[PDB]
Design a protein around this nucleic acid. Structure first.
Ligand SMILES: [Ca+2]
Ligand SMILES: [Ca+2]
Ligand SMILES: [Ca+2]
Ligand SMILES: [Ca+2]
Ligand SMILES: [Zn+2]
Ligand SMILES: [Zn+2]
Lengths: 351, 550, 550, 351
DNA sequence: GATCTGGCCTGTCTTA
DNA sequence: GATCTGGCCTGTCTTA
DNA sequence: CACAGTGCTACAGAC
DNA sequence: GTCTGTAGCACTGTGTAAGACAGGCCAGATC
DNA sequence: GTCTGTAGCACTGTGTAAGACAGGCCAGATC
DNA sequence: CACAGTGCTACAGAC
């Protein structure tokens, strides 16, 4: 366990408090630049490379085949691994754009060509969705499941803006948890089914999803109605059987209380959960390891890296997982005159 | 003594600090009183009439997604940000009036001048109450270098954004035929005295995030407002107004922001036109205005959907510079102020390069260029009485372009053909300037207006001939805008300068004196108080008391 | 109908622009008037009394190298510069009152309070009128970032220097016998309400040539004036004043620069002592004040004439670092304000080093320097409600110095005995601070005063104990000044901080507003009318009216 | 006859509108500087080296046995040529102190030691003046003369502050031309004889003096009484006999009208007057050549180096002669923010 | 080869 | 050996 | 053809 | 014949930070 | 029983650019 | 222990 400071070098104005790291085929790409894309990099996506403490951001270039994506802030990323037909995919949906609206449109982001010289072109294919569309929402989570042997996806959680009845220009900027109905999205075709369950009383937000082998475990998120941070862990088990995707669920004894957590895969299916927060005021310092198996998910805390007094004292913090048990964290920094760089960074690593 | 209205105006309008005022009141009261002025709590109690959230009103049809409660005063503009640590920060402080309410109050304040314009018209009273049309110039402009307060929180950036409107005219249509018939028209729109603040924020123009969060509700107000007509009980009689909103008052950097255009030195120069740098260098004077809201929106949908699987380099040509979703409609119109500043600083640059012989030796150094600036400014001060400048304020931009100043920098350049050239250029400019900067060129300067296109033609031909070395592949945004789309604009509006940024921009000065003298002053309260006190400064009812019928 | 004096006080005391005022007058007069306020032209001849060059006076013995004309008002301070091109140019605008005249006007304005003090004493007013003693604190401090005006001429730098004074006390001695006897003592010397401007200039502090050309006359009348006693006709009778001039209000840099020292970071730190930097490292609390005017003058004559023929190094050792002839005489005293800011910024730096572990790792990287600043200011915003500064105002020094502010930092330092140590330090500081901050510690805070030497001993011991790594060969000027010569100067002047720069400095705020509201506004007249209008702001006669007698 | 534009490199805050350039034994040292000396070079005297357009100023350090000098503004320099026993001398008297005063004390400044690497220690020596002392003054001129064959010195011109009885704090900064009496200063001993002039009914200032072979020519200077800049040139001739140094004088018909002129030596005794101000507004552009022979002064205009429009338009200009027909000029400059260098420079040369 | 002294850069301090 | 991309660094421009 | 000032001096109008 | 209000006079303060594009070339991966 | 003046509340604005000294070391000239 | 504010809300005192 360890952490070391990172200088953001040039161009640290890109990062905003929510953002997303896409780890695919080795190098990982930052996503969700602050504001609208600048023609320095119109694509919107950046390869990130960390070398000798320096954090360098490179301008990706999309393929001509692709649609271009707005810099969504806090979307649901589900990494879909490599298999037929066309590996490997990052399903991004739907976040909220640099204007204030919620996309509610699923994008599929994939690698395309390389290099020639250390260069990677990408392609974004938006997919049409008929339904029973998912309501436009953000901070929900999405996950990839395979039942015999068909692959589908599970979409649940997240806030949305107040429906257009109660919607008022004084309450316009409020949000509310969208209702608790899971959406099963086939990757292709674009059919989105909406089911609900009696076990799910309420909607959540920022609840970290783990997905393996036709089963999906939602960690405790943040419920806005009763303002609890459930220590109840949630599990659900779906199997797709012609011609319906039948779905079940269970509550668990014990689950974590943390919102806005960072899951960095290390082992086969074993992740290290950093966690953003214990409670509304006080952030979680504790670091935790989470494996999962067919019996169930097993939790073991591991000794957290010793935090510099700065990050121990910082009000808010965020980041993403570079994967391979390696992850990035980010600390806002107040200084005058402006740094200008707004965020100190640290790289964290397991074992 | 005197009526509390006259007292209030004689406070608001001479800039007296409340504590300053009360100081004076105690003094006049104690010494030889027979106190004259009215005490503070009775000014405050005379206040509630003038601010919004007071006069009752109703909208036919009812407004979309807007509360029907008409009593709401100054609202914190955060507008329900849930301030959950887990979400985007709540950092920015703001206060705003609920737009419709600010309107009806702003306008019922004109009940005096609208009824007196109606009686000037000798127009029918009971009949034709409902056929009105109201044209509102709104403007939004940002302001930097604003210190902040220690305070209890929340942490907030330095720069402050002030969103304001002004009522340009109000007119009538019914029974029919009869064009439409002006009643009231703002006589000096560029005065601070008429600009109505609406939203006050602490935000940097650069971050788009919080700008759209806090101005989002405002936009839904206008857009939901255009369709409805407003019903106001005035002169005893309820009457229905239509509102026509023109945003004209932005600097271009911010226009470019709000409309998703790439900015601001981008290959696609014109906000109103599709020409690149090079194509605007070739043919300067011939262009047709395309860019507007609806097409920019369809343009973005092309940039995103991208149905033709075209490559980026060329895609950007096909959408012609729209990379982002515009969140507001601004009328396709130029701004007068930064046009004047852009051209002034241009001729400052041409003069500078012209002192030294630029076109003989094309490749000057840093040092000859700094030296050219030194002899230029030394001369301007020596004769034109103009100090060297940090940045080009329009006031030095008005004393810079005159025939006198040019003829004082004519002494500098040895070549006697060039003197002819830049001298004649400047006279061409003075001939076309009033065209856009006067309020209504149709009256004040008609013969310059009819000659504009031909006049700009000799101009561009003169640049592309003699000065070409500087203009070959590069032209400032403003030279292009001003040599191309102005005849089209004054044909569409008839006015440019009246729609200029001044009234917003110039009002910032008030904001600064209201963050110091009449502020609260603590982070929480203080915007509320600058805003209220602004609104009073700018109300007519108070200003009528200034002349006191001479 | 107000007396024109009362009205005038309303005007200058509530900061009302002539045009703002006349606006008010017209308005009140038209409505219900029965005009109350008095017109402009009757105020303009109303204050002819309150300005200088009005009341008649004479010195005996007659002053040296000063004219005998007592009617001279605002004088251009250039004071006869021939402004020939061939000579050293005159680049500076200034205006000043002839010092003596400014004085008799200040005092003739205290005539009221000294007569009511004399009666209160029940000291017979008519008898024993000749033995007065007048103690005048003068202060000179400059100001940056004042933008030049376009104007005509001449070219002038941005920075502006405001030379002022204030009457601290006036007392009496005769018949003999007892001491001398206070009559009047300024009750709040640090108020900008009493700071009397005298000379206003546009000058850069750095150039000595112009600062001494313009202030040269002023000094000459001080040092010609110390000798002769004044004769005023006051309370009906001819009475005579002695004047004791203490310049106490200069900041350190300017003391050094008018005293011929090496500013500001030179090896010889103490303006009042000969100690070097490293010599004042080892020993701290023990020092004896030497440096004084006549001594620095003789010391220059040694540095120049150089009879012993040492090399530069040794010579600079022999005069203890007097490299230049001082011109002005300045009292050997310590400014309170910049003392407060210098100590606060030192503790701010100690905090920064205790956030990280400086004594554990002696060689910190630059990135961790910035990182420590960012967590420190994060902390002080979350608790203590403070926001970082570039240069530190003393008001952030007053929130930083307190013990509960050291509490939010004590939580930052992991180490326990450190966290105790700096906490103990800060309590030492709060115990010694009031000594030099408060007006008269001889009464207000006697026990801190008596314990101060022991208390500072305690402190320096603590420093050289746990902090030595920071203090080994280097100590900030003010830490030394404050741990060494304070008990001495409080014993000497009787009190300190009443003599602080505060009462000068504050007044600068007025010079900014008085350069906008009440400026003329053009280069030529602008200093003239700021200065006049300032003087009127300062006068007691008006503030008396503005009290309104409860 | 040409001018090279010069960069002031670092540290252009030193130079000031009046100043002096001492050319002795090769390199020339600048003298006088804004305000009081700074610890960087406490002596106050800088070596000047001009290489590849760069103007570089270096600290000079005095010998232990020498007095230290205030940075005078506009003194009278007389460069005393090599002979018994002690070359090479610069007689500096008395200028204007930066703390604003006139100093009436006369300094003899000279070379001492080198290098060991390119370093020249100098020695300053005050001289006590037995007299009959000269009134402290500025802009006057002083020149060395040899008659049969002993050597004395001639001091005349300049202004001074208003008579100390008549000087009022309102008229303090006023200044008047001191009375027209010449002071013959023997170098040693300190005897200063004051002598009346039936031919000179007025004093003057800034008058460039050229001294050859027991005769001294005063070129035209600004008179402050009638404010006229006489075209007449004024020659005097000094008779040193035992023990009386009686002095005659004569008026010359026609000469140049100039103030604050720069005399740059070229030939043996041939200096070119480099110009100055002809009137209170217009500054002389024309560059002029002056030989001095026993017959008389031979004066020919010379084609002036073509001036860049900047210096042709400059309000004021100054400089000094580096000798060998080479000299320096300086143009105040404006801008915003400050350049920082308040003065552009140019180097002029003959042939 | 190899000093010396500068020269600049860097480095920081201390004042405003 | 020698491309290509990415890099900064610089050299500009245009708006604020 | 921004606009409301910024103070003082002359120069007219008012009982 | 004093009192009073307004136009001459020259000039301010509010217009203030980012990005785009083009060329070089050195670094560094690819073969 | 309305009217009126003053203390709570937390916080601002005026404190805003230079120089000194120490050590290294590369450039550059004797020798 | 700088000092004069900065506006509003409660909370007392006044016919
Ligand atoms: Ca702007
Ligand atoms: Ca602005
Ligand atoms: Ca200062
Ligand atoms: Ca100051
Ligand atoms: Zn166009
Ligand atoms: Zn000392």
């Amino acid at each position: 366990m360890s952490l070391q400071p990172l200088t953001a070098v040039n161009c640290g104005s890109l990062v905003q408090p929510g953002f997303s790291l896409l780890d695919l085929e080795g190098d990982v790409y930052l996503f969700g630049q602050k504001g609208w894309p600048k023609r320095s990099c119109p694509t919107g996506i950046f390869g990130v490379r960390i070398k000798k403490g320096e954090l360098k951001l490179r301008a990706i270039s999309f393929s001509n085949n692709s649609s271009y994506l707005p810099p969504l802030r806090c979307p649901a990323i589900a990494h879909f691994e490599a298999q037929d037909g066309k590996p490997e995919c990052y399903l991004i949906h739907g976040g909220r754009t640099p204007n204030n609206e919620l996309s509610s449109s699923l994008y599929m982001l994939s690698v395309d060509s390389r290099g020639c010289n250390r260069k990677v072109t990408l392609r974004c294919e938006e997919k049409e969705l008929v339904g029973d569309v998912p309501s436009a929402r953000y901070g929900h989570t999405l996950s990839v499941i395979n039942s015999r042997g068909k692959t589908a996806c599970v979409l649940f959680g997240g806030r949305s803006y107040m429906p257009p009845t109660e919607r008022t220009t004084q309450n316009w900027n409020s949000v509310v948890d969208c209702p608790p109905q899971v959406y099963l999205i086939d990757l292709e075709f674009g059919c989105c089914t909406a089911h609900t369950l009696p076990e799910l009383t309420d909607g959540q937000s920022f609840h970290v999803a783990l997905a393996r082998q036709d089963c999906v475990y939602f960690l405790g998120g943040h419920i806005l109605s009763s303002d609890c941070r459930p220590s109840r862990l949630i599990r659900l088990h779906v199997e797709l059987l012609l011609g319906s995707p039948v779905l079940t669920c269970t509550i668990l004894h014990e689950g974590l209380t943390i919102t806005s957590a960072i899951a960095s895969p290390i082992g086969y299916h074993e992740y290290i959960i950093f966690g953003g927060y214990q409670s509304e005021t006080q952030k979680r310092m504790e670091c935790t390891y989470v494996g999962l198996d067919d019996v169930g998910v097993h939790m073991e805390s591991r000794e957290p890296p010793q935090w510099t007094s700065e990050i121990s004292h910082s009000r808010t913090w965020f980041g993403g997982s570079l994967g391979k048990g390696t992850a990035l964290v980010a600390i806002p920094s107040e200084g005058n005159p402006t740094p200008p760089e707004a965020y100190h960074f640290y790289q964290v690593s397991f074992q | 003594g005197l009526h509390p209205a006259v007292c209030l105006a004689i406070r608001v309008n001479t800039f007296l600090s409340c504590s300053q005022y009360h100081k004076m009141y105690r003094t006049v009261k104690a010494t030889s009183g027979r106190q004259i002025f009215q005490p503070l709590h009775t000014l405050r109690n005379a206040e509630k009439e003038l601010l919004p959230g007071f006069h009752q009103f109703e909208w036919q049809p009812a407004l979309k997604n807007v509360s029907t409660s008409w009593d709401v005063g100054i609202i914190d503009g955060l507008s329900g940000w849930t301030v959950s640590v887990d979400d985007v920060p709540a950092d920015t402080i703001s206060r705003r009036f609920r737009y419709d309410v600010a309107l009806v109050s702003a306008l019922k304040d004109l009940e005096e001048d609208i009824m007196e314009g109606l009686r000037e018209r000798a127009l029918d009273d009971s009949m034709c109450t409902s056929g009105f049309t109201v044209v509102v110039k709104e403007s939004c402009d940002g302001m930097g270098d604003v210190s902040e307060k220690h305070g209890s929180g929340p942490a907030v950036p330095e720069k402050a954004v002030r969103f304001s409107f002004t009522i340009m005219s109000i007119s009538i249509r019914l029974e029919g035929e009869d064009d439409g018939i002006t009643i009231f028209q703002e006589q000096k729109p560029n005065s601070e005295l008429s600009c109505r603040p609406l939203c006050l924020m602490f935000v940097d123009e650069s971050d788009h995030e919080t700008l759209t969060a806090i101005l989002g509700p405002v936009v839904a107000e206008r857009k939901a407002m255009m369709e409805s007509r407003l019903i106001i009980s005035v002169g005893g009689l309820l009457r229905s107004f239509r509102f026509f909103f023109r945003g004209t008052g932005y600097d271009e950097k911010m226009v470019r922001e709000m409309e998703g255009l790439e900015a601001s030195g981008s290959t696609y120069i014109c906000t109103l036109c599709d020409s690149t740098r090079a194509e605007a260098s070739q043919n300067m004077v011939l262009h047709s205005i395309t860019r507007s809201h609806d097409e920019n929106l369809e343009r973005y949908e092309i940039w995103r959907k991208n149905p033709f699987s075209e490559s980026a380099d060329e895609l950007r040509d096909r959408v012609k510079g729209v990379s982002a979703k515009p969140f507001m409609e601004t009328q396709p119109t130029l701004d007068a102020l930064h046009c004047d500043i852009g051209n002034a600083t241009e001729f400052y640059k041409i003069f500078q390069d012209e002192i030294g012989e630029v076109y003989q030796k094309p490749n000057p150094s840093r040092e000859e260029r700094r030296r050219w600036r030194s002899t230029l400014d030394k001369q301007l001060r020596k004769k034109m009485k103009l100090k060297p400048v940090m940045r080009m304020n329009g006031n030095y931009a008005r004393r810079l372009m005159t025939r006198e100043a040019v003829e004082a920098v004519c002494e500098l350049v040895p070549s006697e053909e060039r003197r002819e050239a830049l001298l004649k250029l400047m006279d061409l400019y003075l001939q076309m300037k009033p065209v856009w900067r006067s309020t209504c060129p149709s009256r004040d300067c008609p013969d310059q207006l009819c000659q504009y296109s031909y006049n700009s033609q000799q101009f561009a031909d003169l640049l592309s001939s003699m000065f070409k070395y500087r203009y070959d592949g590069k032209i400032t945004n403003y030279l292009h805008k001003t040599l191309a789309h102005v005849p089209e604009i004054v044909e569409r509006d008839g006015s440019i300068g009246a729609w200029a940024s001044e009234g917003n921009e110039s009002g910032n000065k008030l904001f600064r004196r209201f963050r110091k003298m009449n502020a609260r002053q603590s982070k929480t309260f203080e915007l509320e108080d600058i805003l209220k006190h602004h609104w009073l400064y700018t109300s007519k009812y108070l200003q009528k008391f200034m002349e006191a019928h001479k």
